[PDB]
Write a protein that binds this ligand. Sequence first.
Ligand SMILES: Nc1ncnc2c1ncn2[C@@H]1O[C@H](COP(=O)(O)OP(=O)(O)OP(=O)(O)O)[C@@H](O)[C@H]1O
Ligand SMILES: Nc1ncnc2c1ncn2[C@@H]1O[C@H](COP(=O)(O)OP(=O)(O)OP(=O)(O)O)[C@@H](O)[C@H]1O
Ligand SMILES: Nc1ncnc2c1ncn2[C@@H]1O[C@H](COP(=O)(O)OP(=O)(O)OP(=O)(O)O)[C@@H](O)[C@H]1O
Ligand SMILES: [Mg+2]
Ligand SMILES: [Mg+2]
Ligand SMILES: [Mg+2]
Lengths: 105, 134, 433, 485, 212, 117
Amino acid sequence: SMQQVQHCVAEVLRWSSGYLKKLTNATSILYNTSLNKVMLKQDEEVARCHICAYIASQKMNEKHMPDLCYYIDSIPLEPKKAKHLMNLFRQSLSNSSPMKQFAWT
Amino acid sequence: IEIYELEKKIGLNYIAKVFSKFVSTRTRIAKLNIQQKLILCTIIQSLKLNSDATIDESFDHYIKAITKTDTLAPLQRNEFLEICTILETCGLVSIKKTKCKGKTKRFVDKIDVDLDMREFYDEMTKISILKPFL
Amino acid sequence: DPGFGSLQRRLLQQLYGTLPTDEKIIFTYLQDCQQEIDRIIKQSIIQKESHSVILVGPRQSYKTYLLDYELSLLQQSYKEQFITIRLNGFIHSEQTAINGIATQLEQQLQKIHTISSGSLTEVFEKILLLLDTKITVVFIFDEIDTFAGPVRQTLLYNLFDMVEHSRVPVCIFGCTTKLNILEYLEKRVKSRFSQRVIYMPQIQNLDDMVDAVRNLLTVRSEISPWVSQWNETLEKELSDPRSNLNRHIRMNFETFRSLPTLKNSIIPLVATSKNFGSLCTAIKSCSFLDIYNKNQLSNNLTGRLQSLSDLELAILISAARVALRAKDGSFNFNLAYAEYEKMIKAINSRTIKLWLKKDVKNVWENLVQLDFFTEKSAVGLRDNATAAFYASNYQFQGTMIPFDLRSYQMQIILQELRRIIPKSNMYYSWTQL
Amino acid sequence: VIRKFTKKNVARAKKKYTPFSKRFKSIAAIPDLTSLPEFYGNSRFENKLKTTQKHQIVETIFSKVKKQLNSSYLPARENEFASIYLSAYSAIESDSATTIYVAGTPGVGKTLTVREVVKELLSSSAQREIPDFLYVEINGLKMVKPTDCYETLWNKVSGERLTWAASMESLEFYFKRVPKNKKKTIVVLLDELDAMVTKSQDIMYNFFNWTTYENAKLIVIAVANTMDLPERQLGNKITSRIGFTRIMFTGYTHEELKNIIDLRLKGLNDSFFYVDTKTGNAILIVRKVRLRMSADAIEIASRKVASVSGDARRALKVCKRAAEIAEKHYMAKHGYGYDGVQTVHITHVMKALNETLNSHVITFMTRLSFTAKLFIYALLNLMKKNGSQEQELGDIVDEIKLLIEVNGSNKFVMEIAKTLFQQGSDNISEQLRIISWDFVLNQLLDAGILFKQTMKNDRICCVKLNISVEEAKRAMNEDETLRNL
Amino acid sequence: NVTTPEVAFREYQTNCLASYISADPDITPSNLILQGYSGTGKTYTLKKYFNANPNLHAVWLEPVELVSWKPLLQAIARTVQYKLKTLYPNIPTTDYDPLQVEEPFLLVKTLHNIFVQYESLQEKTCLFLILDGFDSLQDLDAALFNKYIKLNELLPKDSKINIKFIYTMLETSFLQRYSTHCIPTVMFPRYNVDEVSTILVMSRCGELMEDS
Amino acid sequence: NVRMMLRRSMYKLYSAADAEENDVSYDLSLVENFKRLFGKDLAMVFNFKDVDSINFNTLDNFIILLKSAFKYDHVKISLIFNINTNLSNIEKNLRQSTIRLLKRNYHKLDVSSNKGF
Ligand SMILES: Nc1ncnc2c1ncn2[C@@H]1O[C@H](COP(=O)(O)OP(=O)(O)OP(=O)(O)O)[C@@H](O)[C@H]1O
Ligand SMILES: Nc1ncnc2c1ncn2[C@@H]1O[C@H](COP(=O)(O)OP(=O)(O)OP(=O)(O)O)[C@@H](O)[C@H]1O
Ligand SMILES: Nc1ncnc2c1ncn2[C@@H]1O[C@H](COP(=O)(O)OP(=O)(O)OP(=O)(O)O)[C@@H](O)[C@H]1O
Ligand SMILES: [Mg+2]
Ligand SMILES: [Mg+2]
Ligand SMILES: [Mg+2]
């Protein structure tokens, strides 16, 4: 699933470097939490990891690199539906214990 | 007649509508994510070795399969029984409570599968990470 | 000295927990859980909201204690607002619980201001008409796991339906020791259950046990002239980490982790003291705790071995030798007597009397009576009355053959015999095969 | 007369024995049962549970939310409703006898849909498009005996009280021999059908064979757990008589659960309340406080519950538990007892959903004593060496002794060995069991961690783990002492 | 307020009986077990303790005679109300039939009906039920003693009559089946040879001297 | 079993006592309250038909069960054992405490058809 996470964060953004490895690790942790806590229909599953990668990217912009840019367009869903699912994922998994114990630094 | 006046002579199509309305494991697997397909692979693999195996023994096999593969984060026992309840809802799993037949006889909960094995191997071999779990 | 009598009575009723409601002792590690129970009761009796909840914890983990404390605390201010129905899973069966609920309904409803008359169908129909401001009915339902059987769960179904859909506010407090209590429930019963499970708190560290002992033994009221000096004696013995009382609390923490277990030893330490100085010396020394611990193990295997005669010990060593040499661990009277006779000849050749089989039979029967030998593949005491009734109507094959041919198995093996038989015993050399 | 035993607690109902077939001279002598006072149904306990209230009870903002989400107080069941209503309406209008089979998982709205169909049929019969009918509801789990259904239905038809065999022959004679112009249509709901299954299947065959009678005018709506209940537990006669057109109640999707919860909270979500700050009592239209429950929290609760079960009870209870958690935090922070924007957030929903998902087995075994942990550890070592899944208790005794005597240089073991084997005391002999051996054995048997064989020999009695091995190891890996050895 | 008798080799057991058994129900356990094998002086010590304290109200039952659980329940129902009539003869009572009890909840109901008619008493008192030989019942199962541990919980807390159970057991394994209930247990170890010699002398020399 | 033995014995005792002179529980407490219920005292004679075919554990436990009636002042119990083989078969099937109990007052009587022709 490492190749999938790399491809999703490559489509979202634009591999042993620190920021890219932490972004892929965060995307993998959100993906593994998302498979159990948030339950998706068949179509929306196809755009799961993108959403996960997207919110990972936003966290970096929140702190550790305000200059990093990201574009939601790489999510294949309808942009209203993609944004609504992103809001669900972001609100649901921001307060998770693996991302309360994570090391963004 | 009921289908005709609910949708509104009577032809072949309404007889076929009855016979499709009042009467499949390929579509059930296709509606799952990668975590639930992983659990269904370890359930069937654990039932070849034992075939009288509880949920705790099915969860016992799943932890050992993860540690030799490191695919997806290992999850808890009650999270395992929830996915088994999701596959219970989908129809792939049929959970019963029967008495075990060892030296100590009590009532235990155990997993039974009755899905078509021909269509199970076709759906799982397309996904590369699940092929260690067959 | 009536002051020491008053102090002794106060210490005993603190240790039995039979204080008044405003004076009753709640431990620190038990507060928050109690507060959670304090919410649910107060949402049912006062605010007329229906609740169902199962308390899960081991035996003697203060489930009944906290429930009675909550009911007695709400009993003094809201007396006409609720009735209490108590069921126990041991006393009440699945059919007699209907009659228990019915007769408790009459003896509770007339206590504020018929259901229990007629056949079982009529009584259950009248209960369903009665249940399926308002008076809150509170069900305290101990051993809820016995009614969550794998066949049919009619009473749990109907009671959770009363919680879900009735216009009468119902609170149900089930209590159990089973950790996986939600898997016991049938699917429709589990659907009607509120899924609210309260796990009772465990003792997590030694300071919790020391704090609970301090709460149990400190007199927080001035009803004796000896109260203050007893309080500084107790605080001196509990604040010293190298005192005997702290050592016994530490031993309980490592072995039992049970405050009723400690209370059952502390109560006769307090009660057997005659004056204040004797009580202070007893709590400083805790030697009565050592005597209590010695008496609690006096009828175990070691203490029963130490009460044996020479011929009884010789027959037991011979039977253990025959059982160790055998592959199934089985023996009878004849092989054990052959081993005994060989042993006595080998002792007298390097005197000790040889007893005949006629006299060794009584020794054998006493060894069976003292639970040293068991009959082979014996079930023993049955779990329930139906299986014991089935067992009582069957003639076992061991009871029809002569006693010299009955197969027996050892409760203590020869390796355990060598460990606790003293080396100065004359049969000590025969404990090694 | 000296009696060999006594039955001094006999409670016999006053129910008669003569059936309906022997109270008239002939078939042609039976009068019109519709024009009879006792026939076809033509509460005394409600006063007993009332008291006087002498305290004004404080209902907060979340109280109306939690009362609103109760199951006692149909956007998604419109095709099942249409099918059941069409079948029942056609059977009432044509004086026909029929069976409608309905099955599904718990809480998917089967009983609610059947009752709404029955209420709409009664509304139609009130304004005279269909002939008048009687409605009887029989739950199989509310019967003391399964034959009580026979006593119930006949008592709803004739108003008589008979015994169950006499009631069964009375119902048989009424359905078979009484002409249709002399009787009335009866619609009977059989709820929890699997509880009416006996060993000989008398009641099942009788109830679905009365529907095949010409003169019966009986409509039976049978509600069950599964589609294949007749094909599993019933004979081919009853399976043939029930029929082939069986109605599925599938679980709710997340949109349907979300619509059910929003239709509950339609008038009180994003609303305003007058709240007295000194006490906390809230009045729907002193501070004006705006109440909302977020649609994202409801949405993900609907998604999780719909993926697990599709149970409307579970979704309503998860939302009610989240409201309870929010109200508990609110009353804690405001100092509110019992006598500007309040939001039921998504974290409360996720706290409600994870509370039935956290496992207290590892937490329970983590806080056990050292001797219980040593028992579990020695059992795990025996399962590692001999691989049996059932270990003898004497083997556990010798393995505990071996683990003590091998790690005799460990500081904790040096400090605690006299506690395990002499209870820290001289004048107490070296014991063969550890201190609190049967105490921790019975403690692990009470918790359901272990299973113990029923034998009276303590050594060769076997003990099996009832929980999974990795959570037991996990609990053994938390401890600092059993990690070292 | 308890007289402690003098039993020659049961001093600890007599002190424990003085510690656990009293006329105050406030400081008396609901259940008490005396465990020991045959001929260890359990019955002897309990008789000497109750003879030294005549204010204690004791009802003696032998389960070995009763054989099954149903005659044991009926015997409890008969003997409790007979002792209560012979204890307070000026109290008007209704004679409940002990044969009405076929089930344990019927015992609970019968005991409640007997105990509610003694609320005119001034002080709360204890009624001691000695089941001398509980595990000598010929129809014994593991679930029976559980019904007797929890029997006080189904009886009213504010009653004037408060029943207390004193059990006598023989086997160690039967007692160790119920270890997590934390019932106070006094154990009677087997006598040694000097103790049984002294007991035999002081119990048999008086009638060996006066033999014809 | 022992329970059926006691129940049949106590039903026979109560039936005979009522047939010569409210019901009771068919149990050994009837022996305890026999003088309180009938005024007279009691002498029970137990005749065991075909002792060689009985289960000797059940008979043994019934003998120790009947031994409990010795503490009542108004009770006399006699036992009659119909032995068809010899006494050495029945002394090895009972326990030694039972033999010591039965030794205090016992009489042999060899009565048959071949006795002395
Ligand atoms: N009503 C009460 N008043 C005072 N003390 C009590 C009361 N009920 C129980 N206790 C005491 O509480 C301690 C054990 O707690 P409790 O009996 O509540 O345990 P529990 O967990 O309910 O037990 P179980 O699982 O056996 O039913 C004992 O010391 C007991 O004497
Ligand atoms: N379509 C619906 N619209 C609104 N509320 C619903 C709907 N379906 C179910 N509910 C709610 O769920 C509760 C349970 O539904 P119901 O009693 O009909 O379940 P059921 O399918 O018959 O299940 P069971 O097999 O457990 O009897 C109802 O009381 C109601 O509050
Ligand atoms: N300490 C003692 N001092 C004097 N006599 C004693 C003592 N202990 C026992 N005896 C004598 O031995 C007899 C047997 O004792 P007791 O009946 O109390 O035994 P037990 O342990 O209750 O027996 P079981 O379990 O068989 O009923 C007593 O009746 C008495 O005559
Ligand atoms: Mg309790
Ligand atoms: Mg229903
Ligand atoms: Mg005795």
